[PDB]
Amino acid sequence: MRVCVIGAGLSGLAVGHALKERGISFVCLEKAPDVGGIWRQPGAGERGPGYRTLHLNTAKQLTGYADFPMPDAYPLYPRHSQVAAYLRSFAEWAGLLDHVELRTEVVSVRQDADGPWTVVSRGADGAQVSRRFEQVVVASGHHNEPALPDPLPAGADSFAGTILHSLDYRDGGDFAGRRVVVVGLGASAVDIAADLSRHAERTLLSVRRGLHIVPKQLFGMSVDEIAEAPWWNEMSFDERRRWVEQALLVARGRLSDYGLPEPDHPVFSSATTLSDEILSRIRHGAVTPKPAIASFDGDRVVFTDGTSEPADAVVYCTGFHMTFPFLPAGCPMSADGSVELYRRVVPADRPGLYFVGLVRPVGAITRLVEAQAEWVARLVDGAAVLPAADQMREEIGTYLTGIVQRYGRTEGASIQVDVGPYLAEF
Ligand SMILES: Cc1cc2nc3c(=O)[nH]c(=O)nc-3n(C[C@H](O)[C@H](O)[C@H](O)COP(=O)(O)OP(=O)(O)OC[C@H]3O[C@@H](n4cnc5c(N)ncnc54)[C@H](O)[C@@H]3O)c2cc1C
Numbered sequence: 001m002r003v004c005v006i007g008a009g010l011s012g013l014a015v016g017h018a019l020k021e022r023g024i025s026f027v028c029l030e031k032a033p034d035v036g037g038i039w040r041q042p043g044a045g046e047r048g049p050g051y052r053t054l055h056l057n058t059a060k061q062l063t064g065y066a067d068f069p070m071p072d073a074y075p076l077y078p079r080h081s082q083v084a085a086y087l088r089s090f091a092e093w094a095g096l097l098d099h100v101e102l103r104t105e106v107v108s109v110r111q112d113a114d115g116p117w118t119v120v121s122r123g124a125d126g127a128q129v130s131r132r133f134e135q136v137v138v139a140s141g142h143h144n145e146p147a148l149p150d151p152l153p154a155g156a157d158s159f160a161g162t163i164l165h166s167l168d169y170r171d172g173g174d175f176a177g178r179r180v181v182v183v184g185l186g187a188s189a190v191d192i193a194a195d196l197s198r199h200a201e202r203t204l205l206s207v208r209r210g211l212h213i214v215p216k217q218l219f220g221m222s223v224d225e226i227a228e229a230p231w232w233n234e235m236s237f238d239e240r241r242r243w244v245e246q247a248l249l250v251a252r253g254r255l256s257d258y259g260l261p262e263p264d265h266p267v268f269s270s271a272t273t274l275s276d277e278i279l280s281r282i283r284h285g286a287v288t289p290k291p292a293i294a295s296f297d298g299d300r301v302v303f304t305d306g307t308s309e310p311a312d313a314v315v316y317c318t319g320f321h322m323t324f325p326f327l328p329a330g331c332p333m334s335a336d337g338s339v340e341l342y343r344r345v346v347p348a349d350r351p352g353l354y355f356v357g358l359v360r361p362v363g364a365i366t367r368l369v370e371a372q373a374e375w376v377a378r379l380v381d382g383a384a385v386l387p388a389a390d391q392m393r394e395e396i397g398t399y400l401t402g403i404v405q406r407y408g409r410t411e412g413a414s415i416q417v418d419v420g421p422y423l424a425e426f
């Protein structure tokens, strides 16, 4: 009745928890046959951005919900099945599954002229039902449209093997004995390359823009938990980058003696990739670094340095696009295509609509999603109020110009936040 929550992954569950605490009536619609979001997919063989060898890269204590710790048997970085099991247990413990419509996919959300929203949902049969809700919380994630590079290098149609996105990547054993190129230096790319490196005969890592390769751990500490080490917070920006970047050099050297492009910036500049493996896999010959792909010559891949390589498959680890197909008008955006959401959550001109989890932070997203859920629940029942619309887009303006200044007009900087000052206002 009162709130329709689109999604029962980690964000939609935090939302149902927050709605349930205030006694707010809500239903939670979710396409998958179970709660869990992306983490439930690798274990069910479903096209999703995860893969059979995916673990957390955030500390479990900063990753689980604050009122519901993960089993103490869990390691610091649990596997995706452990994470998916944990999230099923939360929904159980929180009495949410009575409110979750599984196998229910939202197809349109439209704001009626009188205030409420008509939500059309496709049930398990495909039977479309059309319902009305006072408010809609969107928690559908932003990793659900693959982003393939344009242009795909020449000869793509000549190619004897398979070209695929990480979305379609599933397990390294699906390429045992083959020769595979991985394109990208993202979190998906180093993980997939390291996985392939123990199954494919040969694994090539084709990277064209250098990213910073930071281990999951410095001084025995997770880097997401160093982020709030009080001794680290009293650092100035180039005081910590001073120590962070010398921390890297003793731990690993710099990227330039692994055959890796080093980046056009220092750390924290655009993004850093977290790995424990990829540098050592290079140094054991299990992964060979390569520049950008230049063309597909039929059976081989040609890289821009002139070198060539026989290749049975290319997995594009190039990330995801941010879309909302159930929203005819789109997520609020500026013409630059930057997200326009007051405090990263609230459209300035659309009462009753809220976006949760549509942020990308230093470290784990859970505390932020909890903060967002708690605020939204108090907006839904009037304990909290919003500024007038002109004032809301003033804060969006300040956020955005500061975004173009710091991270630049890259793709996806419109949702970038630092855990600390963001949580600090909830
Ligand atoms: C490979 C990978 C690794 C990551 N690792 C970490 C990590 O270690 N630590 C961390 O803190 N974060 C990590 N993240 C970030 C990750 O997004 C969050 O941890 C978490 O998954 C957020 O879940 P969510 O609920 O926001 O979205 P999702 O997990 O995407 O869940 C959204 C849900 O919406 C559902 N849905 C229902 N109806 C619809 C509909 N009509 N249209 C669309 N969707 C619908 C989808 O089925 C899906 O279950 C990782 C992300 C990726 C891709």
Ligand SMILES: CC(C)=CCc1ccc2c(C[C@H](N)C(=O)O)c[nH]c2c1
Binding pocket: 057, 058, 214, 223, 224, 226, 227, 244, 267, 272, 274, 360, 361, 362, 363, 364, 365
């Ligand atoms: C150098 C340094 C201390 C960086 C701090 C840091 C940055 C990013 C992450 C992530 C990515 C996460 N998967 C996300 O994008 O939400 C997990 N832990 C992190 C820690």
